[PDB]
């Protein structure tokens, strides 16, 4: 028996909330409505633990994630992407979950695709549909009428471009499932360029051979986009560059559609004379820009004089102010209390097409139905937020999910529009607990919000902020900063992924990453400034960069078998054991190579000890089977214990250690380099699955030059064989082992960027093609999504 306290900012919001408390029965969750006078007071009440959840505009998210609020987005409306997999099955499940009779339930085939014809059973209407479930225009037919004959529209645009290129020289490379890869290489002419979601080239990305290709960003095609627009009456005659001195009405000071997009556009067009933040308030500059306005939540009295709320409620971020919100701003414009209204496109209807039109930032006027051509930018959906501590997220999610299933009236009310949520909300879905303001808004929008609130960091060109993942790293990096003479500074994160996030947020400058994190790091636009170099035998390239290198100290992944103690080859591996499921030398390389060949599900349908592999899968018992050396078959040493008992995939080094006597335990003491070999050959000969790229110190592109030079100078000072190495060592520490770099690192070598693909330019084509399929869509995550450019379209109808 739990309760969820929703915070209402107005009397109408409390009325709708009490309507829900009366009419919506959710088992084991009681809805309680706490009343405040404004958005900010509700944010504070949630921060104080007096309320649990509220709905915020996207423009309010960033300031919500900071003091004195410290709120986090938890529940948001999902958008339709061209990367949605198995969409028909999920839509059918969701429809079946709704406790109502007669609603449309999508009809799916045996494979999970949409049936080309979709029918609403209770009404008898039928229509046609493409591979994403979008209705073909005009194909809706009622009962008792000849139905539209429906074709399968399953072939993506890219694969069709392929097969209109191999019949009778541009052949485009595509991601698995027929999406365009963001980077295109012309195999004949050697040119490379970048493309958006539908494969049309973006301007200024084409590069000749030998030259360095442009950085290609991942794109996602998204449907139903809402926009920030300036709405005006057709009777007026002013244009956008004549906004100064006019009367205006806004949805809110903290909303994107009401304020932030407008200010960004005014700054870009140089219409708004204003310094930077912390020198002038944006609100003071806007108060000097407009004569008299209604901007709810504003603290300048002229930006509030046109507001219509009664005293104590005037200009508040609350529906108690009649001019608050998108519909409130439209009301102000209609009642001639302002000359222009700044609001979301969702408040536009064709009823207003007679009197109203849209003011475009290019100094033209257009009708309301041109809002996709006449806007101040896209406005992402609002979100339900709670405390960052996330104590009540489960209860809130359960309540909203059950209320949506039981058809409770969350997204409409007789009392008014946009009360507790946006009325345009179709559904609310749960977000990953990883999602914060940064992940929700995305890198670009996050930096825009950061700059707009005066938090933007201008990095130093002579100092490098190194990110640490634990307290020992922080201590060693503190020693390094104390001896660096202002060249090195220290930041703290929980894990390497947090360090990548901090670098993206402008809170840190560089971090060392192992291979696992490199895919995400390169997807988000980071680059390797330097790389760990482990060749103990040469040391040539360390003191002098470019004393050319023959071996980087890279580990080489192979499978270790016997000189005819056993009879194994690659073709009959079916029917050994592996170090771990997470290890890259082993598991990742062999599994990727196995299931890139064939097709299969190797999880059991291949071999006859791989710790972390469920329990007792057909292996995992030849060793219980935990991802630690507390079982004797974990790691390189335990995987070598796998090959001597129950004999039948490891780095090459694993033989050279323990062979010849170096590890004595009884089993590995009397073993020799002649008794064990590798399949592709003698144990030292290259008979390898693939080479593993070295760990990379990554940073932003603009910071590459500064990071490399500062690291080079510091390396000349400290580390292995340094002028003042007696003061500090880079690759060793009394605080711990392998802290900021692997202790066996010979040095750091500046990454030489080749005129190839950055993914191949780091991983190497064998590793890239084997592990990630040479595709930018091999893995998806919240971070990769936050670094993906959302591109809008009236529909996905490009099939
Ligand atoms: N093992 C090794 O040290 O390779 C040499 C060095 N390091 C990489 N990780 N690379 C990635 C791929 C590559 O092209 O071989 C190379 N790419 C550049 N820019 N320099 C090379």
Swiss-Prot record:
**Which locations, inside or outside the cell, does it occupy?**
Secreted
Assembly and partners are described as: Monomer.
Family note: Belongs to the transferrin family.
Can the keyword Signal be found in this entry's annotation?
A: yes
State the Gene Ontology BP annotations: antibacterial humoral response; iron ion transport
SUPFAM superfamilies according to UniProt:
Periplasmic binding protein-like II (SSF53850), Thyroglobulin type-1 domain (SSF57610)
Q: In which tissues is it expressed?
A: Plasma. Highest levels of transcripts found in the liver, the lung, the pancreas and the brain.
Tell me the disulfide pairings in this chain: 7-42, 17-33, 88-108, 119-126, 128-150, 158-174, 194-216, 249-332, 294-307, 304-315, 360-374, 467-499, 477-490, 524-787, 542-747, 577-642, 609-623, 620-625, 680-687
* Keyword line: Disulfide bond, Repeat, Secreted, Signal
InterPro entries noted in UniProt: Thyroglobulin_1, Thyroglobulin_1_sf, Transferrin, Transferrin-like_dom
Which parts of the sequence belong to the Thyroglobulin type-1 domain?
85-150, 155-216
Task: Using the record's annotation, list all stretches that form the Transferrin-like domain.
Answer: 4-84, 217-454, 464-776
Is Ribosomal protein included in the keywords of this UniProt record? no
In its UniProt entry, the species of origin is given as Aquarana catesbeiana
Spell out the protein name for this chain: Saxiphilin
Give the source's domain of life in one word.
Eukaryota
GO CC terms in record: early endosome; extracellular space; plasma membrane; recycling endosome
Region feature (Absent in transferrins): 87-221
Q: Tell me, what does this protein do in biology?
A: Binds specifically to the neurotoxin saxitoxin. Its physiological role may be to transport or sequester an endogenous organic molecule other than Fe(3+). It may participate in a detoxification mechanism for neutralizing a microbial toxin.
Query: Gene3D superfamilies per the record?
Result: Periplasmic binding protein-like II, Thyroglobulin type-1
List the Pfam families: Thyroglobulin_1, Transferrin
């Amino acid at each position: 028996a739990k309760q969820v306290r929703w915070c209402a900012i107005s009397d109408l919001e409390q009325k709708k909330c009490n309507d829900l408390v009366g009419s919506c029965n959710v088992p084991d969750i009681t809805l309680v409505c706490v009343l405040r006078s404004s958005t900010e007071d509700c944010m504070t009440a949630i921060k104080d633990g007096q309320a649990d959840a509220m709905f915020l505009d996207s423009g309010e998210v960033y300031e919500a994630s900071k003091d004195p609020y410290n709120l986090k987005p938890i529940i948001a409306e999902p958008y339709s992407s061209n990367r949605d997999l198995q969409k028909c099955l999920k839509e059918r499940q969701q429809a079946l979950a709704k406790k109502m009779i007669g609603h449309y339930i999508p009809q799916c085939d045996e494979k999970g695709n949409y049936q080309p014809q979709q029918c609403h059973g209770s009404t008898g209407h039928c229509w046609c549909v493409n591979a994403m479930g979008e209705k073909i225009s005009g194909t809706n037919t009622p009962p008792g009428q000849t139905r539209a004959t429906c074709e399968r529209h399953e072939l993506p645009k890219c694969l069709k471009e392929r097969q209109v290129a191999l019949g009778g020289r541009f052949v485009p490379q595509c991601d698995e499932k027929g999406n365009y890869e963001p980077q295109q290489f012309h195999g004949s002419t050697g040119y490379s360029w970048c493309v958006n979601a539908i494969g049309e080239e973006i301007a200024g990305t084409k590069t000749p051979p030998g030259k360095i290709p442009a950085t290609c960003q991942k794109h996602d095609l998204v449907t139903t986009c809402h926009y920030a627009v300036a709405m005006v009456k057709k009777s007026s005659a002013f244009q956008f560059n004549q906004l100064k001195g006019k009367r205006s009405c806004h949805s809110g000071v903290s909303k994107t559609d009401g304020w932030k997009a407008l200010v960004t556009v005014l700054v870009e067009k140089k219409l708004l004379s204003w310094d930077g933040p912390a020198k002038e308030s944006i609100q003071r500059a806007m108060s000097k820009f407009f004569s008299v306005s209604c901007i709810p939540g504003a603290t300048q009295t002229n930006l509030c004089k046109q507001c219509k709320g009664e005293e104590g409620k005037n200009c508040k971020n609350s529906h108690d102010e009649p001019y608050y919100g998108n519909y409130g701003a439209f009301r102000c414009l209609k009642e001639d209390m302002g000359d222009v209204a700044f609001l979301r496109s969702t408040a536009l209807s064709d009823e207003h097409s007679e009197v109203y039109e849209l003011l475009c930032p290019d100094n033209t006027r257009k009708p309301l139905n041109k809002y996709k051509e006449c806007n101040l930018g896209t406005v992402p959906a609002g979100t339900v937020v709670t405390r960052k501590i996330s104590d009540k997220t489960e209860d809130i999610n359960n309540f909203l999910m059950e209320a949506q299933k039981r058809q409770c009236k969350l997204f409409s009310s007789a009392h008014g529009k946009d009360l507790m949520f946006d009325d345009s909300t179709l559904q609310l879905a749960l977000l990953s607990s990883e999602v914060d303001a940064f992940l929700y808004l995305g890198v670009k929008l996050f930096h825009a919000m950061k700059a707009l609130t005066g938090d933007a960091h201008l990095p130093s060109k002579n100092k490098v902020r190194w990110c640490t993942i634990n307290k020992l790293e922080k201590m060693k990096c503190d020693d390094w900063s104390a001896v660096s003479g202002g060249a090195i500074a220290c930041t703290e994160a929980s894990c390497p992924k947090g360090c990548v996030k901090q670098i993206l947020k402008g809170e840190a400058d560089a971090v060392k990453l192992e291979v696992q994190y490199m895919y995400e790091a390169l997807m988000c636009g980071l680059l390797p400034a330097v790389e760990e170099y482990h060749n103990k035998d040469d040391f040539g390239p360390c003191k002098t960069p470019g004393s050319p290198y023959t071996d980087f100290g890279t580990l080489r992944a192979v499978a270790l078998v016997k000189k005819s103690n056993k009879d194994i080859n690659w073709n009959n591996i079916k029917g050994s054991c592996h170090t771990g499921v997470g290890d890259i030398a082993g598991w990742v390389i062999p599994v990727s190579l196995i299931r890139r060949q064939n097709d299969n599900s190797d999880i059991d349908s291949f071999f006859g000890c791989a710790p972390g592999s469920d329990t007792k899968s057909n292996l995992c018992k030849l060793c219980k089977c935990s991802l630690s050396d507390k079982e004797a078959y974990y790691g390189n040493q335990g995987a070598f214990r796998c090959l001597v008992e129950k004999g039948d995939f490891v780095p090459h080094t694993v033989v050279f250690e323990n062979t010849d006597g170096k590890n004595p335990a009884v089993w590995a003491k009397n073993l020799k380099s002649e008794d064990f070999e590798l399949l592709c050959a003698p144990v030292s000969n290259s008979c390898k699955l693939s080479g593993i790229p070295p760990p990379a110190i990554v940073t932003r592109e603009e910071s590459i030059s500064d990071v490399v030079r500062i690291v080079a100078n510091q390396q000349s000072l400290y580390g292995r064989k340094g002028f003042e190495k007696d003061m500090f060592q880079l690759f060793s520490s009394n605080k711990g082992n392998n802290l900021l770099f692997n202790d066996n690192t010979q040095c750091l070598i500046t990454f030489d960027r080749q005129p190839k693909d950055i993914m191949e330019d780091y991983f190497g084509k064998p590793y890239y093609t084997t592990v990630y399929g040479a595709s930018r869509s091999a893995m998806s995550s919240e971070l990769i999504s936050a670094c993906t450019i959302k591109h809008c379209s009236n529909s996905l109808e490009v099939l």
